[PDB]
């Protein structure tokens, strides 16, 4: 009531942050930024929790205020900067480049990548509209406005953002058979290809996706992110590659790998 909220209580944080239940009444509330609050990973959570480079928040601010962290090419000294899906996180020390992608469990997994592939990113197109003076632009999933796109670029497509400048290098159509990556729902983190998409004019497109192991699932188009055609993904996939092993076979794989 009465205005915008500034505190995010613990147990009200997103469950994929894996913040521990006790040791604190509060959780880091992400600032306004490129990604939605529920869909983002704050830099303090990435640094202190997922990467353990800091033991507490004061060490996170110490790292951030010395230009050590960079999000999508820019430093982003904000402690609760809302880094999100597909964002490239660059640390000048350790020569490590991170792209934020979900593991098959549906959590932001630590994915280490190389310099050349971290030079760019991918952005799902959320709207194509004419601006002032009749200039077309596309808006991506991270809030980027890119002027003068290709006319063939439409909604739900994915552009290859230059990330060194506001330029589009290539685009991929949202079509059947192309490899996609799910960004929401209970199927979050899986990787598969489009069987087909059904319309339901008036709301909530549904998309049938089949993975590498012939397993099919249905999800809303809001959660579908195009990453390439059949094979050869435009980005490096995380370990697991979104196959969704069941708990039975995950147990079998676990016992084999730790039993030596």
């Amino acid at each position: 009531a009465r205005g915008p909220k500034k505190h995010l209580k613990r147990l009200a944080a997103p469950h994929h942050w894996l913040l521990d239940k006790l040791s604190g009444c509060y959780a880091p509330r992400p600032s306004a930024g490129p990604h939605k609050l529920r869909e983002s990973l704050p830099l303090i959570v990435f640094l202190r929790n997922r990467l353990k480079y800091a033991l507490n928040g004061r060490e996170v601010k110490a790292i951030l205020m010395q230009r050590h962290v960079k999000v999508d090419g820019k430093v982003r000294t904000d402690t609760t900067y809302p880094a999100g899906f597909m964002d490239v996180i660059t640390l000048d020390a350790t020569n490590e480049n991170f792209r934020l992608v979900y593991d098959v469990k549906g959590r932001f997994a630590v994915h280490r990548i190389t310099d050349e592939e971290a030079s760019y990113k991918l952005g799902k197109v959320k709207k194509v509209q004419l601006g002032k003076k009749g200039v077309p632009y596309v808006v991506t999933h991270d809030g980027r406005t890119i002027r003068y796109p290709d006319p063939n670029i439409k909604v739900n497509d994915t552009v290859k953002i230059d990330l060194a400048s506001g330029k589009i290098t290539d685009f991929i159509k949202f079509d059947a058979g192309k490899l996609v990556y799910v960004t929401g729902g209970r199927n979050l983190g899986r990787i598969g290809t489009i069987v087909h998409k059904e319309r339901h004019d008036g709301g909530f497109d549904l998309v049938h996706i089949k993975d590498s192991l012939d397993n099919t699932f249905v999800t809303r188009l809001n959660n579908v992110f195009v990453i390439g055609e059949q094979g050869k993904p435009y980005i490096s996939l995380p370990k697991g590659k979104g196959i969704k092993l069941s708990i039975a076979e995950e147990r079998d794989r676990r016992r084999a790998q730790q039993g030596l």
Binding site: V135, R147, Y148, D150, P151
Partner: protein, 226 residues
């Protein structure tokens, strides 16, 4: 009955405790801002013309300019007015203010001398209060001295010398709105950034129009052929 008389041309002030109320009746039933002759208030105030400037009353409630009442009234006070200092942005408060009519309930008047008299006072006229500082803006010290339009105000700044027991430094104000090469560098950068953005946008528009022409010819080729 104190009187806070002031001499703005020399900037001095004194208190005058004046008894024998018919020496005070000349002030009575008079408004703030209008003059009052010095013939009846004092014997040494011959040729002095006092202008009513304000003052307080008993219980310490200040007179307010504009209210034509001899009594004290409650007024809701906004910002940028006398008798009130807002503690919050946009805060308003109701405060009792004495009217602008001089009456018996005043504990003290505040007065401004607008014309010097035929005598001299003990502290007001003889002592000239020194100015606390000079101007700070480049053109403010230019009009303070009337040098020229194109001169240097580097070496005409009024300086104050501060002793600290043994050492003796001199300090001057930092000139504001001074024409400096840094300011000129900033100005030409903004104008260069404006034109550079404009050229880049024109090249982006020209490239896109060429792209539209190439695609229009392509779609026209297959539509006519097939």
């Amino acid at each position: 009955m104190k009187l806070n008389i002031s001499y703005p041309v020399n900037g001095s002030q004194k208190t005058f405790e004046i008894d024998d109320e018919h020496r005070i009746r000349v002030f009575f039933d008079k408004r703030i801002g209008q003059e009052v002759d010095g013939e009846a208030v004092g014997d040494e105030f011959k040729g002095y013309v006092f202008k009513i400037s304000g003052g307080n009353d008993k219980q310490g409630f200040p007179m307010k300019q504009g209210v034509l009442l001899p009594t004290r009234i409650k007024l809701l006070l906004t910002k940028n007015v006398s008798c009130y200092r807002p503690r919050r942005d946009g805060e308003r408060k109701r405060k009792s203010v004495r009217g602008a009519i001089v009456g018996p309930d005043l504990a003290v008047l505040a007065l401004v001398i607008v014309k010097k008299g035929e005598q001299e006072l003990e502290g007001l006229t003889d002592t000239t209060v020194p100015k606390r500082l000079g101007p700070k803006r480049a053109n403010n010290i230019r009009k303070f001295f009337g040098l020229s339009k194109e001169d240097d105000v580097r070496d005409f700044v009024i300086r104050r010398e501060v002793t600290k027991g043994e050492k003796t430094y001199t300090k001057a104000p930092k000139i504001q709105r001074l024409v400096t090469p840094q300011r000129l560098q900033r100005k030409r950068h903004q104008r260069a950034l404006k034109v550079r953005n404009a050229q880049a946008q024109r090249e982006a528009a020209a490239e896109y129009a060429q792209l539209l022409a190439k695609r229009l010819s392509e779609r026209k080729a297959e539509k006519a052929e097939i």
